Amino acid sequence: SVTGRIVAMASGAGRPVWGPRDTVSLMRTGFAGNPVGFRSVKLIAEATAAVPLICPVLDLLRRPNAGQGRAELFEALIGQILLSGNGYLEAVCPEPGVPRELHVLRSDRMAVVPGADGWPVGYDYTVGGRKHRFDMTGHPDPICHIKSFHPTDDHYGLSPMQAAAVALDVHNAASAWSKALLDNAARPSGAIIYKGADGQGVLAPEQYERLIFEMETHHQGARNAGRPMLLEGGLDWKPMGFSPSDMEFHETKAAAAREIALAFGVPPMLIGIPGDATYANYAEANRAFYRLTVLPLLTRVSAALAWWLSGYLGAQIELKPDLDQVPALAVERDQLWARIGAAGFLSNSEKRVLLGLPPT
Amino acid sequence: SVTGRIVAMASGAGRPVWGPRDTVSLMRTGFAGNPVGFRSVKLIAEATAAVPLICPVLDLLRRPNAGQGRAELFEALIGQILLSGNGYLEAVCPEPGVPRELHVLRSDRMAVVPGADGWPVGYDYTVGGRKHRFDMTGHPDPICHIKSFHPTDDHYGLSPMQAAA
Amino acid sequence: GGYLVDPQTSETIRGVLRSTASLRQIASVVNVEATSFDVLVDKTDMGS
Amino acid sequence: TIRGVLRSTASLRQIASVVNVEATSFDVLVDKTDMGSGWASETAALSETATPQIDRITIPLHELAAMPKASSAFDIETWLANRIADKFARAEAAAFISGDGVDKPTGFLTKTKVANGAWAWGSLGYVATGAAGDFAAVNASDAVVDLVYALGAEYRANASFVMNSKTAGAVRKMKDADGRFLWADSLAAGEPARLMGYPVLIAEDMPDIAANAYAIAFGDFGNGYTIAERPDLRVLRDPFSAKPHVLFYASKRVGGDVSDFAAIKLLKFAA
Amino acid sequence: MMLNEVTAVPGTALPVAEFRDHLRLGTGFADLGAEDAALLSYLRAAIAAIEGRTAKALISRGFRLALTAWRWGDMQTLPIAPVATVTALRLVDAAGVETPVAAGWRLVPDMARPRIEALGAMLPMIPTGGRVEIDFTAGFGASWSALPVDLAQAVFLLAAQYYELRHDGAAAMPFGVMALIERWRTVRVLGGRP
């Protein structure tokens, strides 16, 4: 905070700081463009919305606004964090405490203002040429700004799609390689070469319609596969091939489809990409998914809702994921109940306090 | 909310916003065209209809209308969400509470209207050149608009077929 | 004092009203995405 | 980190009345004269003493635009945004002081000055120094002090001097008959920043000492000069027009002239 | 990109009196001028053959390079190689108005890459639907003596050939016509986008 004043002047106080320009184009080319970048965010954002929470405040979260439910809110919230590294939540307060409206402001059209002491004073929702200038020079601070970790930038997040932005363009263009190869390719199944007495000679349109009708009827198609095809003088049939037949950038697409899944943190088994068996039997890969890239993400966002929404209340509230009755963690729950349940030496109430039960 | 009021006047209030151009052509080439895209939607839409629900109101859901059962409704509903990212349900209310008709409106011929404050005021069912202009300036709001998540658009869904196009 | 007071304007920029009947109402429109459209009619009937 | 030349920052923005305006113009409404009430007679008609004729002065709220073409060691988006905000903070400073009427705010120097003592409303008052080249030779600073005391006691509650650097130089060059520096006596003092009990604003767009130039101003610019503006800065991060050069578009709109012609007094270096 | 010539060569600058010494016509005859109408017809036909195989100019006549869209964002390599003192990048408009522009463009002289690189990171923009003709005088020198002599010899090896055989009749030197030309051709290996 003491050094906060020094970085603020360099950027320029009172003026909007934009950060990354090409953020909106990674969405259309990397999330609406390829299925791997599409499925990876949809797999996470529909997983963090499904996790229950532990606190009143959750009555706001259950019904944030019209037409945007509890689970639909976090899909919009985490879906901006995975896409552009930043999450925004406007609170509309007709009432003084616990404001009854939440709105995920998209992070394409939002810009920060550094202000005096380096910590932000303005946020600017910029649609068309129109700005809004939300104000942070107050106590309730009407927008929570959830940052992904960015080491070099002081105001935004890193957005894992930016780290995979080369592997998206490999997977977008290798998939479009095979598309435009199926659309721009002339393979013939042969060529009836007609030289003539000279090195060059055309055949007359009388002879040419004769050549079609014996080729149309008697030689093409499945039903004429293999006629013995008499070739008189001058004529010759050179059959062409198609030498790379399968596998046009097949492994570099399948390797880039795994590096996209690597950056968002989904395992290759969940998304459905082919590859070597790393995880075994989905009791691991679903448990690894909710432990390395979902529950760390959800306990970081819920820790920002636990502090931003407590600024509207008087008493501070904690708000964490449940990490109980989330059915992907049952292999960590069998393993912990059967450990203490088999420990017969310590008594009955001495293990209800370990497994989390109210003792009797 | 406050941001939404500014967003409206950029696109244009009172005028229909269409969104995806090709969503009528991805259906014929991606759902009636290949078996893999056909079976994938049929595998999901016949799975969501089979799941029971927990609540009266479900008596409407069991028998929404003539010739369109409970399981046939969600196959039509999810079959529009997987195809075009948007689900629509018209309710006909002769009675004030629990309207006895549900209809899956197809999302090819439906268009949104942003209205004044950014949240929608009109939905336009456009077949041929003929419109309807459903009204959202009331409390019961006769169409539920189920969106798939779309980060760039403010009015529609993303439709996984568009991602696999 | 004439600079002190300023007029009140209308709430909306209003326009001259022109007709809406357009033959779009009575002809048949098609939701199409193309560069051309090709109707298929039968000029004459088969001989019987 | 890319460096630049460090230009002057003091801009008359912090001592003039900054009004956030949203329309096309800002209309200030000042009466030109007094009520004119007289002591009534005990047997007289006594009617229609007078009425102050009001006047609307229009702040046109012009716009300012600079359009550079962009054409990974240092990052242009932040640096050019930190240069063009400085240029918009400095180019409006020239318009606030010596701007003319066309498309830009008219500065307080361009308002048809009349010698004080014959002061009317439509102008600004000045006081003469003496000889035309510089301050008076016999008694320097007499022009400064009667510039202070020829203004009005109500505006001198919070008034300030406006000079550039090399007029404050010529002020600090004033010395007594022993040469002891009337302002900031020693060579160890520095800028005392409280000339005649009033602050000094070093605004470089003021003219320097010349044959007739008005190099020193003094006033309560909070009543005198009204800067009406819109606080934002447009940022068109343009990805079109030229593939080779980004050609960012940045614009701020701002206007202003004098609201009160009694607040500002000038020092004419002539007879 | 049209690249026409404003003015041709004068003809009097061509060394017809020295080409006649090359071809061994005759020394002291009283006629001496029956071939003058045709000898410069083959010198202009051999220079223009070597001006196309080498993309050089050789007499420094004035050119006019009328083009519409810039080939690269800022560079604009000129076709005719040995240049000096680009006169005018007058920027015509969609129709009519021709405004010459100093425009902050430079000229990078080279025999291989005669660029016109701009200094403001973007050449002067082009009114949509209008061309940008560039007047420039490109060549080695004004007279025949200012040429590289091996290229001047390649004209004399070639225009002597057109004088000695009229139609395409077939007929190995160490430094022939071709081996003198090849250090003046343009060696390029780009078929790419930029």
From TrEMBL, chain A:
Protein name stated in the entry: Phage portal protein, HK97 family
Originating species: Rhodobacter capsulatus (strain ATCC BAA-309 / NBRC 16581 / SB1003)
Record-linked InterPro entries: Phage/GTA_portal, Portal_HK97
Domain of life: Bacteria
NCBIfam families xref list: portal_HK97 (TIGR01537)
Automatic annotation (TrEMBL), chain D:
Domain of life: Bacteria
Transmembrane segments: none
Major location (coarse): virion
Positions of the Phage capsid-like C-terminal domain: 1-269
Compartmental location: Virion
Descriptive protein name: Phage major capsid protein, HK97 family
Organism this protein belongs to: Rhodobacter capsulatus (strain ATCC BAA-309 / NBRC 16581 / SB1003)
Organism phylogeny: Bacteria, Pseudomonadati, Pseudomonadota, Alphaproteobacteria, Rhodobacterales
Automatic annotation (TrEMBL), chain E:
Protein name, as recorded: Gene transfer agent protein
Gene3D superfamilies linked to this entry: Phage gp6-like head-tail connector protein
UniProt-listed InterPro entries: Phage_CHP
Domain of life according to the entry: Bacteria
NCBIfam families, A to Z: phage_chp_gp8
